[PDB]
DNA sequence: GCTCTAGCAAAACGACTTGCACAACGA
DNA sequence: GTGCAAGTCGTTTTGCTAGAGCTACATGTTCACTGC
DNA sequence: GCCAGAAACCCTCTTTTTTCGAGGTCTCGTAACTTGCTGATTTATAAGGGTTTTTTAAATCGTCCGAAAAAAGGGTCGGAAGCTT
């Protein structure tokens, strides 16, 4: 149940969270015995409450006396609804709250505003992306077990390609176009894999078959991973890197683009082949995303970025 | 004692106001409102949570 | 759906919702908040569409399911403490209001730009202050002295006294030269507006309580009424997508302390009159909420507090 | 086919109107009242008085 | 645990049937 | 003949009880044109 | 290019139209009846007083229902008390 070993995250479901006695309870169908009891509580911990659960305000006082973030998620904890905001670490705030500041929005801040730096980041992002691509696809053969065989050179090559293009181009523009083409190339090999047939991606979900149904579902569940991963950093959504500055929600695109072609598209189309419901496929990209530590994965990246760009 | 009754009155452009109900009060809250639903089954459960905050 | 839900424009939104001993929940679609009658169990109704955000006392909870829809929805959810305390406090710590704000609704990303581009920049933050109290004393003048319905009630106020008290703190504001002469500033205008208040409206003596620990009327009411200007405040700083920690004024002894310095706005413009005008009526805590929130909607607190956060990451560039 | 909501607009002072109906209009007259009892009894004999005024 | 769905039963509700009264009390 | 009132009786509305699942469907940018 | 109208597609309710099912009812076919043969063996029976099992009523108990009584609540009128003039 631990979500994220790198933020002390837990996800709580079918249960109620109350407070008997002065300590908050969890009234589970397992009794004294649930898993839930060994949650600590300290100014460490964040919680995320699930599918089918309760809070009452009795409990809300007790966390923050112990100074515990709350928020509201979705079935496997990947649509992040609400949740407390996090405080800002800086000289000149000073409550004595006991609620873990944390002080990432400023080194974000302290070179948003310089483009060069803005670019440098944008590469470092697309960096990690290339090399979680290469990894999913042809070092761990799970997929190659699950039935997702494809071509190793030709994947390869093109990989390798991009990668030495990403060291190069002069500006944002570019780097979005390049991996624009490494998009449409990652389509083919998948679909030729999977003996799909040929693919067309439609946006503003116009398909109808059901490989673009299930990349619109899987594109949903990893931004709602993204955002809680900001979430967990404080950073605000709008302070994006490689999504243009005007872009609602911005940041978190920049952060779901490291898992969107690492993990859920073979999904998407070992699904669609398969057959699978929309509940399975559910399903199965939780699982993958659980077995790919990928919340921890954008945590410690966007925290590399922000010691890098120092 | 089944005579439940209430007046709203609109006093402008975008505001009203209840003036007064006749009979059994308790068919609303405050404000003039009148509940969706009602069941006798026990759904707040209040009994499961207690006050000794020590 | 997500879309064709937030029409209604956040700052013309009709309800501010205040609830006690119940279990909000979601029924049929909807969602509803649930109260303990002795006969029955009663659903009551929460127009999510038209609902700023909602405040939750004292035994009550909340279930998943409607949290989703309030998100959806882009309402706030506040936990506090019983009518006008605290929902935490010990020692010299306090912590008014826990919010929830919804985090699937993406916001504009400029307003948050600007004041984050400003906000690391200390005689910067000092010009926005500046801002702030100078929209504040601009409102006490209008609403004060340029209200009928205020004066129709009885709120009859010595102009002369008020406007010399004005232009005094004006001018010490202009005078200021960092925050902690700023701050004593807003103590000495803010009594000085509780005692032109209170002999105004016939109260005769009063003094403000401390950490709502009063036990007369006034107080419990100006204490209550905080916490509707708080839920107005931190809506209005939500939908411009600022997040509530980056205080300017009341930040270093307050979390979220962006919260208390938008409130401050409308705090004393509206409030302050109508609780001593409750008082006097001798009302109960349930009426002053009512007619509090109707000044409030009749004023535009919420367009006034949204406009003033605007102007001031506009006017820092 | 079995829907039936009239929407009023007050438009403050002592004047107000009817914007729409949605669903079945016949629930509703022009001025959006709702008839209060109905029946399939022969009221309104017109069987029995003609138009043939010569 | 929370909510939705399907099936049931009780109660509320409105129209019909019949028998009959034939009203309205300062100057 | 018109209307009231007492009694009947077909719907129609609400709540109760088991039982079963566990959603929420794009997001490349900048800027010129269009409403109040 | 703009505007308008009409037409194709989606969903559910309302009403006949058809269909189905239960069941009710009648009539004739026919496998198993009835009637007729003999003689050795088994079974039934005429009366009535003393004796087992079931029926039947009465009493009791329990439950249910209805009615009546009591409680509860909505409201009006008049009087007395308190406050203000």
């Known amino acids: 149940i631990l979500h994220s070993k790198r933020a002390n995250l837990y996800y709580l479901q079918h249960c109620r969270v109350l407070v008997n006695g002065g300590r908050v309870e969890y009234v589970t169908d397992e009794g004294r015995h649930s898993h839930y009891w060994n949650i600590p509580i300290a100014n460490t911990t964040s919680l995320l409450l699930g599918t089918g659960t309760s809070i009452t305000q009795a409990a809300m006082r007790e966390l923050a006396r112990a100074g515990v973030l709350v928020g509201f998620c979705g079935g496997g904890g990947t649509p992040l609804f609400s949740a407390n905001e996090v405080d800002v670490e800086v000289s000149w705030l000073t409550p004595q709250s006991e609620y873990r500041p944390t002080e990432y929005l400023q080194r974000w801040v302290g070179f948003w505003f310089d483009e060069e730096k803005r670019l440098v980041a944008a590469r470092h992002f697309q960096r990690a992306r290339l090399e979680r691509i290469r990894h999913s696809w042809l070092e761990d053969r799970v997929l190659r077990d699950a039935g997702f065989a494809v071509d190793a050179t030709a994947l390869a090559v093109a990989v390798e390609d991009s990668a030495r293009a990403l060291e190069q181009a002069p500006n944002h523009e570019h780097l979005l176009t390049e991996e624009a083409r490494l998009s449409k190339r990652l389509f083919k090999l998948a679909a030729q894999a999977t003996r799909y047939g040929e693919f067309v991606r439609a946006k503003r979900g116009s398909g109808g078959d059901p490989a673009n149904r299930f990349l619109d579902h899987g594109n949903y569940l990893a931004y709602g991973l993204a955002a809680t991963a900001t979430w967990v950093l404080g950073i605000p959504h709008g302070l994006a890197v490689l999504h243009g500055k005007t872009r609602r929600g911005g940041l978190v695109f920049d952060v779901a683009d490291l898992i969107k072609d690492s993990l859920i598209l073979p999904q998407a189309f070992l699904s669609a082949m398969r057959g699978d419901e929309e509940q399975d496929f559910r399903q199965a990209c939780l699982d993958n995303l659980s077995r790919a530590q990928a919340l921890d994965f954008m945590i410690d990246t966007l925290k590399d970025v922000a010691q890098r760009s120092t | ?54």
Do not use: M, Y
């Open chain 2, 1 to 54: 004692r089944n005579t439940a009754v209430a007046c709203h009155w609109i006093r402008g452009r975008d505001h009203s106001e209840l003036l007064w109900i006749v009979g059994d009060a308790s068919r609303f809250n405050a404000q003039g409102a009148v509940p969706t639903n009602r069941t006798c089954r026990d759904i707040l459960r209040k009994e499961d949570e207690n006050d000794w905050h020590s």
